[PDB]
């Protein structure tokens, strides 16, 4: 039986933002994906910080505007009364905004997919972290977590 590969988004500190850390996505139990957030350097007083999967990659320029709109294949809404009514990539709307100067949390999401054949696939997309007023503060591409794959391989970074 096939299992889809884990993913990661690596945020780096630059003159544009002190936010740095990672969001890891790993297959979990009962058709869910475990999301592990580990971030520091957040500008707390302009949060709390929504964060979402966006539609386009972060380009080499690191312009978070270039990630364009939210990943929302099923046309969910920004506000809702049950998790499934939010966009697939609306992680903060379903699970909580990032908050504080540092934020470390783990949770399962039952909508994002690691499977490239799924309409809910998030590989190759991006994550944007926003100030509370919507300004995009930092962003990262969603890439493979492990260097080595296949049923005859090990991984050894």
Q: Which residues bind Cu ion (CB under 5 A)?
A: 52, 128
Question: Could you give the dihedral angle defined by the CA atoms of residues 9, 89, 38 and 109, in that order, rounded to the nearest 10 degrees?
Answer: -120
Asked if residue 70 belongs to a known ligand binding site, the reply is yes
What residue number has its CB nearest to Cu ion?
52
Asked if residue 149 belongs to a known ligand binding site, the reply is no
Cβ proximity to Cu ion: between 128 and 140 the closer is 128
Question: Which among 142, 143, 127, 139 is positioned nearest to 89, based on CA atoms?
Answer: 127
Asked if residue 52 belongs to a known ligand binding site, the reply is yes
C-alpha distances in Å from residue 64, one per residue of 11, 31, 117, 134, 142: 12, 31, 26, 12, 14
Question: Which among 84, 116, 112, 85 is positioned nearest to 23, based on CA atoms?
Answer: 112
Using omega within 30 degrees of 0 as the cis cutoff, is the peptide bond preceding 48 cis?
Answer: yes
Dmax over CA atoms of the chain, in Å, equals: 49
We find the least distance from the C-beta atom of residue 40 to Cu ion, in angstroms, to be 20
We find the least distance from the C-beta atom of residue 71 to Cu ion, in angstroms, to be 9
Cβ proximity to Cu ion: between 89 and 123 the closer is 89
**Distance (Å, whole) CA 106 – CA 148:** 25
We find the least distance from the C-beta atom of residue 72 to Cu ion, in angstroms, to be 10
We find the least distance from the C-beta atom of residue 67 to Cu ion, in angstroms, to be 8
Asked if residue 130 belongs to a known ligand binding site, the reply is yes
Cβ proximity to Cu ion: between 71 and 121 the closer is 71
Residue stretches of the annotated binding site for Cu cation: 52, 54, 70, 130
Residue stretches of the annotated binding site: 52, 54, 70, 130
């Amino acid at each position: 039986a096939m299992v889809s590969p884990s993913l990661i988004a690596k945020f780096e500190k630059t003159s544009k933002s002190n936010i740095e850390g990672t969001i890891k996505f790993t297959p979990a139990n009962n058709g869910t994906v475990s999301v592990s957030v580990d971030l520091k350097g957040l500008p707390s007083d302009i949060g709390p910080f929504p964060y979402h999967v966006h539609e386009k990659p972060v380009p080499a320029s690191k312009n978070c505007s270039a990630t364009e709109n939210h990943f929302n294949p099923y046309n969910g809404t920004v506000r809702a009364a049950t998790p499934a009514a939010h966009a697939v990539g609306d992680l903060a709307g379903k699970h909580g905004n990032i908050m504080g100067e540092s934020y470390k949390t783990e949770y399962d999401d039952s909508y994002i997919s690691l499977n490239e054949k799924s309409r809910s696939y998030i590989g190759g997309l991006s994550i944007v972290i926003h100030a509370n007023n919507g300004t995009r503060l930092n962003c990262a591409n969603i890439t493979l977590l492990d260097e080595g794959h296949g049923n005859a391989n090990t991984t050894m970074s």
